């Protein structure tokens, strides 16, 4: 199971909007564009991404410069719809990409927009129809049905998205396919009532997907070195509980106790 994603944000300044685009391959950041930079360019964010030549980066940079301008004009159109004025502080975001099955064929294509942090318009799983989140997005919806915008994104999602994700997955087998198993241990913290907090730690694992079972469960966090951390905890009296850790890099799922 594989995926490519591009996450785009344009934020308005009081009194030119900043545009940031971030590319992901299997949930790992691999390219990034920032308009605030001295010389705005798509930059490699993974070591295996330095394969590509100067023409690749230039082509991607220019496409980012087009998105930035697209995001400006859309921001102006949004102000007209929601009856706001120019110019305050606003946020426009977009998610796009394709999911691949193990057979390397298209599972699902994505295209969705958000204004002010909440849903605006999404392309449906069929890649033909649009679902609008509110009244203003309905104007966009009917405008995009008449001009047939759905077909253009359908072509990307079934074409370039899939075919380039294949290229990226080839170029980074030693890191995208590579696994790091969670080294797990359990800690003991006596509490009020005769109760103890048994806390199961999973540290230094890649990728981020994991399941902890025995109920406080913190959200998965980056270690900062490329690996991830997570823990789960239960309240126990005076220790026949077992923590179970399920992860791709584990031949057998780990079972541990205090």
């Amino acid at each position: 199971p594989h995926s490519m994603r591009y996450f785009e944000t344009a934020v308005s300044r009081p009194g030119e909007p900043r545009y940031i685009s971030v590319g992901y391959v299997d949930n790992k950041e691999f390219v990034r564009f920032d308009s605030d930079a001295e010389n705005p360019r798509y930059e490699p964010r993974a070591p295996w991404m330095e394969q590509e030549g100067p023409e690749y980066w230039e082509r991607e940079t220019q496409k980012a410069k087009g998105q930035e301008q697209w995001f400006r004009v859309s921001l102006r159109n949004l102000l007209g719809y929601y009856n706001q004025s120019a110019g305050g502080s606003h946020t426009l975001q977009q998610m796009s990409g394709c999911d691949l099955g193990s057979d390397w064929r298209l599972l699902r294509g994505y295209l969705q927009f958000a204004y002010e942090g909440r849903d605006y318009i999404a392309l449906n799983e069929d890649l033909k129809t649009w679902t609008a989140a509110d009244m203003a997005a309905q104007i966009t919806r009917r405008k995009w049905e008449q001009s047939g915008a759905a077909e253009h994104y359908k072509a990307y999602l079934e074409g370039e998205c899939v075919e380039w994700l294949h290229r990226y997955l080839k170029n980074g087998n030693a890191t995208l396919l590579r696994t790091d198993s969670p080294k797990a241990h359990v800690t003991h913290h006596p509490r009020s009532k005769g109760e103890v907090t048994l806390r199961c730690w999973a540290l230094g694992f890649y990728p981020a997907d994991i399941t902890l079972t025995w109920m406080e469960l913190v959200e998965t966090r980056p270690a900062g070195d490329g690996t991830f951390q997570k823990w789960a905890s239960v309240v126990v009296p005076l220790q026949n509980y077992t923590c179970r850790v399920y992860h791709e890099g584990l031949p057998e799922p780990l079972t541990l106790r205090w």
Binding site: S21, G23, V31, Q67, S74, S96, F113, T140, H152, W164
Partner: peptide
């Protein structure tokens, strides 16, 4: 490979 949007919002 990034996307190029068509019609604006």
């Amino acid at each position: 490979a990034s996307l190029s949007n068509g019609p604006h919002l």
